[PDB]
């Protein structure tokens, strides 16, 4: 009774693909983001934005295709199809990099949709919404890297382009220009990711190797029942093993699983904060004390100063092709090079 409740009923019906109110946002945006990417990487060039071939059509492979960022001259234009740049011309829109903002913006709203879905489904089934909470980390990463970062820079041009090799280029740029590996926020990110992968592996292995014998089969998967009340593995034996091997062990399963949420989620959040700084060139580039010493003392050398020489190489060698809007011409004689190479 009442169109809203009737719509709510239908939206929330238990079907193969749950829809929900969240689905109204999620499905179109996620579909357009994914479809935008497939369309661009298959058919669309980056000749006019980057001087790059970027599609299967031009001869790129899965590793080299991308949907590239718009030209630097576009600034942070939303680049809407009907906007003042493309003026409703679909072909020109593609050539100007309009699919990049298309995918970034639809992708952002799609992510909002997915997290709302996590909330919606949790509420309906009656579980706590920790999965949604955990998803805040992918969201912080996407927003900081694909939105905040280029927004602090000159234009969308310097956002990551959506492609395998293009993303690799983004990594190397961050090394050469930002010294991003030196950043403690990135370091915490690394710790959360590697620590998360570690926890994933060690927990999976531990459960699988402290299983109770609940069947006669040598393949042990059958001997589990979804409705069984009993733990399928021995927490007590697991605890003794790790206490004796490593010195400490989990004793509390709830803490264990919360910690598995905490580690990679916190790591990703920390890396996002660092990238927000990088939006402004607020880098962890240098140690001042190192530079003062090195400048005065030509025999003082550390791995820190060695890496800056690599960075200087990266900037000078990659900049003219990577930043074509700058029209860099670096005569051969000014290029930094060690002996012979």
């Amino acid at each position: 009774r009442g169109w809203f409740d009737i719509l709510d009923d239908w939206l929330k019906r238990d079907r193969f693909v749950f829809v929900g109110w969240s689905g109204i946002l999620l499905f179109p945006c996620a579909y357009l983001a994914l479809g935008g990417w497939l369309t661009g990487t298959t058919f669309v060039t980056s000749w006019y934005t980057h001087g790059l071939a970027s599609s299967y059509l031009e001869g790129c492979n899965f590793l080299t295709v991308a949907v590239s960022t718009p030209a630097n001259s576009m600034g942070h234009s939303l680049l809407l199809l009907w906007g003042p740049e493309a003026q409703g011309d679909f072909t020109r829109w593609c050539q100007l990099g309009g699919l990049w903002t298309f995918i970034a913006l639809h992708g952002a709203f799609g992510l909002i949709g997915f997290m709302l879905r996590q909330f919606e489904i949790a509420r309906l089934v009656g579980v706590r919404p920790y999965n949604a909470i955990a998803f805040s980390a992918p969201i912080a990463v996407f927003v900081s890297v694909f939105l905040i970062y280029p927004l602090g820079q000159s234009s969308w041009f310097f956002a990551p382009s959506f492609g395998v090799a293009a993303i690799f280029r983004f990594l190397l740029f961050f090394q050469g220009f930002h010294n991003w590996t030196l950043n403690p926020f990135h370091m915490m990110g690394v710790a959360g990711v590697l620590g998360g992968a570690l926890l994933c592996a060690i927990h999976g292995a531990t459960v699988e190797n402290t299983l109770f014998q609940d069947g006669e089969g040598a393949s042990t998967f059958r001997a589990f029942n979804p409705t069984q009340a009993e733990e399928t593995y021995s927490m007590v034996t697991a605890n003794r093993f790790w206490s004796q091997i490593f010195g400490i062990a989990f004793s509390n399963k709830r803490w264990l699983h919360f910690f598995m949420l905490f580690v990679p989620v916190t790591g990703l959040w920390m890396s996002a904060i660092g990238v927000v700084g990088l939006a402004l060139n607020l880098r962890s580039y240098d140690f001042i004390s190192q530079e003062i010493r090195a400048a005065e003392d030509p025999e003082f050398e550390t791995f820190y100063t060695k890496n800056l020489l690599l960075n200087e190489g990266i900037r000078a060698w990659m900049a003219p092709q990577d930043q074509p809007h700058e029209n860099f011409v670096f005569p051969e004689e000014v290029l930094p090079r060690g002996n012979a190479l």
Binding site: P184, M187, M188, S284, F287, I288, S289
Partner: peptide, 9 residues
């Protein structure tokens, strides 16, 4: 241990 190097700079 992580941040101290950056504090000393």
């Amino acid at each position: 241990l992580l941040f101290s190097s950056y504090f000393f700079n």
